[PDB]
Amino acid sequence: MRTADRKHRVIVCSQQSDVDDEGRLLITRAGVIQGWAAIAPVKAIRFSQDGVSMQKDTMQPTHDITMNYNPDVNVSVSAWVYEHRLKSPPRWFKVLSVVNVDECSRYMKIRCRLVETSDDVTPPV
């Protein structure tokens, strides 16, 4: 991917969870990486009037995100990707798997799923 393709600003986040005392649980999503990445869709999207995508299988990736490899970070089973735009609402992507592109260890390809895109999501701390 030519270095002008990476035209999106993302925040890779790892989530921590702790039980709410009243009886719930709460997921804190904190940023660990911020850089430029290039996304591409691999599936259509069913939206629902509120943003939340209505995908059924919840394991078929919809978007593929490519960014710069980093050998010490280990993209877990619990990583999110908060992408913010300028005149469009933010989006929360949930990673589903990673690809070390051609094992050249120069770019990561993160198969991710679109959770929601609405103007009332919780940005990462």
Binding site: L26, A30, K56, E116
Partner: protein, 155 residues
Amino acid sequence: LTYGNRVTLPEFAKYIVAPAFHEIEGRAIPVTGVDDDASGTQATKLPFVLVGLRQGDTSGPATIAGNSTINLRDDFIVEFNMKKERYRDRKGGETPFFSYYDYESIRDRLFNSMIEFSGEHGITFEFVSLDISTEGDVVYIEFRFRQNYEWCETV
């Protein structure tokens, strides 16, 4: 009401489901099949309830001979579409979409409406099963009722 010993779907949806939950503005829609169309039955705003017949069957003696007490059993289902709402906890906290949804209040007050109606007219239904399942920001709460009656022919 027609059918003195029975209650046809429309009557179910408008007399038992409607005076129940006021958050559905009377959007208790009687459909032919609950899965007859998933692309059309997902446009009505959230929340809303469908009512549709699954399959009509018998309950023992069923011969059609003018006098044999033709017994019948109509198996229908009631599907709630309720919008899940996450709890926000300033400090960067949220509750995922897979958190538990309290169907119990729903079952309770639906049963209460059914009991009041049964007391008002003497018509009783059978509960068979309750299934819940979510998708994105919607939770489907699916009751399956079954109603016995006798088909009184007309002279």
